[PDB]
Design a protein around this nucleic acid. Structure first.
Ligand SMILES: [Mg+2]
Ligand SMILES: [Mg+2]
Ligand SMILES: [Mg+2]
Ligand SMILES: [Mg+2]
Ligand SMILES: [Mg+2]
Ligand SMILES: [Mg+2]
Ligand SMILES: [Mg+2]
Ligand SMILES: [Mg+2]
Ligand SMILES: [Mg+2]
Ligand SMILES: [Mg+2]
Ligand SMILES: [Mg+2]
Ligand SMILES: [Mg+2]
Ligand SMILES: [Mg+2]
Ligand SMILES: [Mg+2]
Ligand SMILES: [Mg+2]
Ligand SMILES: [Mg+2]
Ligand SMILES: [Mg+2]
Ligand SMILES: [Mg+2]
Ligand SMILES: [Mg+2]
Ligand SMILES: [Mg+2]
Ligand SMILES: [Mg+2]
Ligand SMILES: [Mg+2]
Ligand SMILES: [Mg+2]
Ligand SMILES: [Mg+2]
Ligand SMILES: [Mg+2]
Lengths: 177, 206, 143, 262
RNA sequence: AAGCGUUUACUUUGAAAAAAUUAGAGUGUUCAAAGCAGGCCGCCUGGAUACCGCAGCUAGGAAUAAUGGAAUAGGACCGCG
RNA sequence: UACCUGGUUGAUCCUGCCAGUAGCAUAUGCUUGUCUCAAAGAUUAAGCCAUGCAUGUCUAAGUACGCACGGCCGGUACAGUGAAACUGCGAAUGGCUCAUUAAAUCAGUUAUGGUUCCUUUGGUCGCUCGUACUUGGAUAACUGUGGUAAUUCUAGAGCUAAUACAUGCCGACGGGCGCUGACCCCCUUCGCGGGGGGGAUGCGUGCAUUUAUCAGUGGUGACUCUAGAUAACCUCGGGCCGAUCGCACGCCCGGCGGCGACGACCCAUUCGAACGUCUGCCCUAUCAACUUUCGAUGGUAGUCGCCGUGCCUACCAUGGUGACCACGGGUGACGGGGAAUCAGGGUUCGAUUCCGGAGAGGGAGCCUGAGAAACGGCUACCACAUCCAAGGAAGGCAGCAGGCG
RNA sequence: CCUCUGGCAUGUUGGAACAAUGUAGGUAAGGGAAGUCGGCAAGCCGGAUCCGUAACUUCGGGAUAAGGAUUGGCUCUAAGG
């Protein structure tokens, strides 16, 4: 059973674990589960124990510190490639994306590159221009339809006031009667 | 869990209805907010339909309206003085709908002296040397002095309200539901309602 | 008179503390040709559950029952009667239903044994769903 | 049922779809849309069982997602779309335009129209709303909530809608003498002039309608759809022209037709 | 034309009333139980109608059976102050 | 098809039952050549279940650096299929069963003016007046060390994206509208005064939310409706005002552009749901009084809930139902559309293919989600039961097959 | 049971030890009448408030039946003139 950070025994204990807890992968959404984890205090009753060296000593151990493992993937976000290769705001990123070499038996050697996500490209600029054109034509058609309704209401209200005008004229005729 | 059921209780005749289904989810109850006075702490609750509710737990300020002269201000709440529901809601200081609180009269005094330029509160003998009330009350032009003179005939206040202003704190009644909406909105008690609740607080003191 | 409860008993809509220098009463018509009574306008009571001066809508069914008991406060019990037809025998049964209806204090003098029109509203209590809409006196009983 | 239901049995389907008893356990459940569950006719029912352009639901899917059919001036790609009353289902390759009206019986009819008629259709207003800046809103029977309408158009009228702009052109006020379609109930599919309006406060109001051949009949307001000023409609009427001649007259008119054809 | 008109019960009509079932219309599944199809040298068509108790809604009828009015005139009607 | 016959007597006429007669199911016996349809572990045991299956899902349009395949035209990213994995949606439908439940479920009828509603469809999405040529940092798949008798168990180390999760602006946009108003000017008076215009500066100024005040565009039979004005608020467990995606690719003189996808406040609409209104059900009195401060019936004021309401709490009132059968008990009781028998009457059945309900061994509690008190989801307790190294882990056929009883 | 007024010097002796056996109080783990003629003796329960109370019966009782819960201090609130 795995040890778990922040449980503060030396033995084993059972917990409800959720999404975002350690030592548990939920299958369906919102699922919780009883799992039995181990205390975070170390004692002699451990099968395997994980150690992470943070400070380099004097000696070059042939197990760990001699062989550098190269990091497998290169940065994909344009912002992180700007941070990695210290780009300015103006200069391009596309020549400074790391591409990876590819070689095995039989087939041709290749070089492969990631899709650079979130860069300023003309399709993004076209989308941004398109919805702001949608906004200005929404205000346009609102102005149009409101003015058209104002004209139609002015028509109907002058009709109603002239009809009630001849009705008030009939009232004055009956009062003169 | 805690439920709101008509099926769990007796008929009109007094007979016992036997349940045919479980406690459904939609017949739901929840623990009370029991909103106190303190530095504000509002929890959100997920609601039927994916909505949300804002339970106050501690709540220091609230937006109270002074209805006769139409000014509402965010105002700090100091005490709960009366509750028609229960006296323990007065004792353990609890904000519910239609509970009666005390709130400090300082924003209403600021608005009143800004609007009419007359002293309200002000036990006479004290005078503010930092001159802010002086530039509030003075310095009007000749064109606008008759405007303020036209206002100050409609600037007389009730004597009970003027006592509460000299006290520095006035009675309000809460009208929002602070366990439901989140706010402590209400209105200043005036007139017949005011002297009714003053008679109730005087009868409580004795 | 009024103000016999713990809280202040007031009609919610009308604001009574506008500054001066009597109290305006809120009322309405409930419709369906039911003429709102005179005591609902010259009245000094307030009522949350009055059909004329309160926040209830009369909607749906319009029934009529017979007042039997007026012991509950602001509400009474009417007794409806009807003939139920069994189909084997070609006869009727006298059955009855006792429902509790809300009696506003605008209808002042009501005795037992007079036919009362009620109207369906929102559920006002556990067993009350009807307001009293108009009252007619009994057979004679004008003394 | 712990939520919304998604199926429909073949037996419990509304009968005017005229689905056979034997070939299926399920009927096609109409998707939610601008018409009610029992008032609409699904587009799979319109193609497969009646026009027979398709044979099964897979061919219905192929027709509907080659982007061919264009209902109410717009292409819908779902099989079970609800096509209801007065809807214009247009097919572009055959050049064939269909308007959805009930015939003399309760069922819907294949009703071929011209493109000049298919450019518009007609809608009963259900409610007038006032929106967030004093903006008059008109709501139709197919939920077309066009706003700023003509302030003479009120609650129970009908309007003519140009589909390309999606906007009103003219209207018919609900008044006596106007023709009306009965869109529901036992009188489903009749055509006649409104001869009387009976008001009822609280309950639903009824209307006496006198048809083309004298036979008057009453129907409540919610089932009534006015179709034109006076004695003439604004749409083209189907075969039969909304009479419901009796079963004896149906009998002898088919008997005389078969006797005359031979 | 709109509104009001002792109240019911009863009777009549109209609405509203899921299909499948039952009765039942059409229709040579080779007949039938069935099914909603089919028929003509592309066209012509059907997939009806009835019943749906009780209760509630509507509009006519007033015979039968209840129910009321004016009797310490707090009665109608016409007006008056 | 509105039907009778034998039987008490030595014989008769009767009341009268027993028995014959005819269907419709359930089992069973004996028999069974053709063909069309067709019920089927409901009755006792809603008793127990080995094994297998029964819910997953990718488009041109969210994420693709697994050479897992593949094109050469590269050097100004990304051809295109694409396993996996993250994300979104479904998994609350369907299927099965009848144990519960007797004004309950359910049927007809109404109401929501007393509420919620994913999706669909239609509206709205420069309305506010105060780095945007695109912001941040995680994480899975991948790689590499492992642990455990064992599971759809997972730890530690490295990398790396978003339509996952956060942050957050320019534009429109120059002013209108209110308040504030220094000051300016005109008329008139002995003059104060009176009467009238113009206006520096500052504050606020959208929709939703919450509260209070005023007036009475569009409605309804009827609002405390809808809309308008004012005054403040706008929840840090934060309501909107797009930091997205794909096809064709153009036009001004770098800027304007077409057609769609996806996403969201609010409003209608749809599928509903849930509480209500009125009327309706089998037997039993060897069940005649029941309910009631341990809510029973109301009133008031609140809490909770989506809303109405004793739903719950506090304070008061002493009510509420019953011979018109309440209350209690039984049911070999799910209700109903219907089925069988039938002259007219009725009588019995309805576990069962359609509608509604309830339930997944028994009860209870709950996460997520629009919708679950969900069980082919979790959390316990009881009963039953599988594997084990004895420390632990996993279960729910009243789904389809099938097995036991 | 403790104290005030009033009374007294522990009841016909004092001192030093603290052994057995006593007389008179107590306490006991685990069991709980196996002891004994026999639960002898000791022990349990115990007041009050709020509930709840059976067989039987002379209808009066049984009945404080049996069986439960609560109880202190303090700070308040309500009601009873
Ligand atoms: Mg009979
Ligand atoms: Mg289901
Ligand atoms: Mg039917
Ligand atoms: Mg004999
Ligand atoms: Mg013999
Ligand atoms: Mg026999
Ligand atoms: Mg043969
Ligand atoms: Mg079984
Ligand atoms: Mg049973
Ligand atoms: Mg049963
Ligand atoms: Mg059944
Ligand atoms: Mg059974
Ligand atoms: Mg369930
Ligand atoms: Mg089982
Ligand atoms: Mg299930
Ligand atoms: Mg469950
Ligand atoms: Mg299962
Ligand atoms: Mg002594
Ligand atoms: Mg002595
Ligand atoms: Mg002595
Ligand atoms: Mg002992
Ligand atoms: Mg002991
Ligand atoms: Mg012995
Ligand atoms: Mg003894
Ligand atoms: Mg005894």
């Amino acid at each position: 059973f795995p040890m778990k950070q922040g449980v503060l025994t030396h033995g084993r204990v059972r917990l409800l674990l959720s999404k975002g807890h350690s030592c548990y992968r939920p299958r369906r959404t919102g699922e919780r589960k009883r799992k039995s984890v181990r205390g975070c205090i170390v004692d002699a009753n451990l099968s395997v124990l994980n150690l992470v060296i943070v400070k380099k000593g004097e000696k070059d151990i042939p197990g760990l510190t001699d062989t550098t493992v190269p990091r497998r993937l290169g940065p994909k976000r344009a912002s992180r490639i700007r941070k990695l290769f210290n780009l300015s705001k103006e200069d391009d990123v596309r020549q400074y994306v790391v591409r990876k070499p590819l070689n095995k038996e039989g087939k041709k050697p290749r070089t492969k590159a990631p899709k650079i996500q979130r860069l300023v490209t003309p399709r993004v600029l076209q989308h941004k221009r398109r919805r702001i054109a949608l906004k200005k034509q929404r205000t346009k058609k609102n102005k149009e339809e409101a003015a058209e309704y104002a004209k139609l209401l002015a028509k109907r209200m002058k009709e109603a006031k002239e009809k009630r005008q001849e009705q008030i004229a009939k009232r004055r005729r009956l009062s003169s009667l | 869990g805690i439920s709101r059921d008509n099926w769990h209780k007796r008929r009109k005749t007094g007979g016992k209805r036997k349940p045919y289904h479980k406690k459904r989810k939609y017949e739901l109850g929840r623990p009370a907010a029991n909103t106190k006075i303190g530095p504000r702490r509002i929890h959100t609750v997920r609601v039927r339909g994916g909505n949300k509710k804002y339970r106050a737990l501690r709540l220091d300020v609230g937006n109270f309206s002074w209805g006769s002269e139409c000014c509402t201000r965010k105002t700090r709440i100091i005490d709960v003085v009366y509750n028609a529901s229960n006296n323990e809601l007065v004792r353990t200081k609890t904000l519910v709908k239609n509970c009666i609180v005390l709130i400090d009269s300082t924003p209403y005094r600021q608005w009143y002296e800004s609007h009419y330029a007359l002293p309200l509160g002000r036990k006479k003998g004290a005078k503010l040397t930092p001159e802010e009330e002086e530039i509030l009350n003075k310095k009007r032009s000749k064109k606008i002095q008759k405007k303020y003179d036209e206002r100050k005939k409609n600037a007389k206040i009730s004597s009970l309200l003027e006592e509460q202003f000299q006290q520095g704190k006035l009675l309000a009644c809460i009208a929002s539901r602070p366990g439901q909406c989140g706010r402590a909105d209400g209105y200043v008690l005036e007139g017949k309602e005011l002297e009714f609740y003053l008679r109730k607080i005087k009868a409580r003191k004795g | 008179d009024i103000q016999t409860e713990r809280a202040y008993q007031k009609q919610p809509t009308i604001f009574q503390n506008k500054k001066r220098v009597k109290l305006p009463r809120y009322y309405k018509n409930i419709g369906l040709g039911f003429k709102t009574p005179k005591e609902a306008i010259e009245g000094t009571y307030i009522d949350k559950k009055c059909p004329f001066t309160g926040n209830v809508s009369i909607r749906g069914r319009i029934l009529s029952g017979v007042v039997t008991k007026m012991k509950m406060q602001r509400t009474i019990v009417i007794r409806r009667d009807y003939l139920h037809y069994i189909r084997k025998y070609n006869r009727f049964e006298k059955r009855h239903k006792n429902m509790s209806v809300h009696l506003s204090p605008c209808f002042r003098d009501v005795q037992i044994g007079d036919i009362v029109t009620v109207g369906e509203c929102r559920p006002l209590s556990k067993t009350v769903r009807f307001n009293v809409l108009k009252v007619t006196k009994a057979a004679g009983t004008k003394k | 049922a712990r939520g919304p239901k998604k199926h429909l049995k073949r037996v419990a389907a509304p009968k005017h779809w005229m689905l056979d008893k034997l070939t299926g356990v399920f009927a096609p459940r109409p998707s939610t849309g601008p018409h009610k569950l029992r008032e609409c006719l699904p587009l799979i029912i319109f193609l497969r069982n009646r026009l027979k352009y398709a044979l099964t639901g897979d061919e219905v899917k192929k027709i509907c997602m080659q982007r061919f059919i264009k209902i109410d001036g717009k292409v819908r790609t779902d099989i079970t779309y609800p096509a209801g009353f007065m809807d214009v289902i247009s097919i572009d390759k055959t050049g064939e335009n269909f308007r959805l009206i009930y015939d003399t019986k309760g069922r819907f009819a294949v009703h071929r129209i011209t493109p000049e008629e298919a450019k518009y259709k007609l809608c009963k207003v259900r409610k007038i709303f006032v929106g967030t800046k004093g903006i008059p809103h008109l709501v139709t029977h197919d939920a077309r909530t066009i706003r700023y309408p003509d302030p003479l158009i009120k609650v129970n009228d009908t309007i003519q809608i140009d589909l390309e702009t999606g906007k009103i052109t003219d209207f018919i006020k609900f008044d006596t003498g106007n023709l009306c379609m009965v869109t529901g109930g036992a009188n489903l599919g009749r055509i006649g002039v409104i001869t009387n309006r009976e008001r009822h406060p609280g309950s639903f109001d009824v209307v006496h309608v006198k048809d083309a051949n004298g036979n008057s009949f009453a129907t409540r307001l919610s089932n009534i759809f006015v179709i034109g000023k006076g004695n003439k409609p604004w749409i083209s009427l189907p075969r039969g022209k909304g009479i419901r001649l009796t079963i004896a007259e149906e009998r002898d008119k088919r008997l005389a037709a078969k006797q005359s054809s031979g």
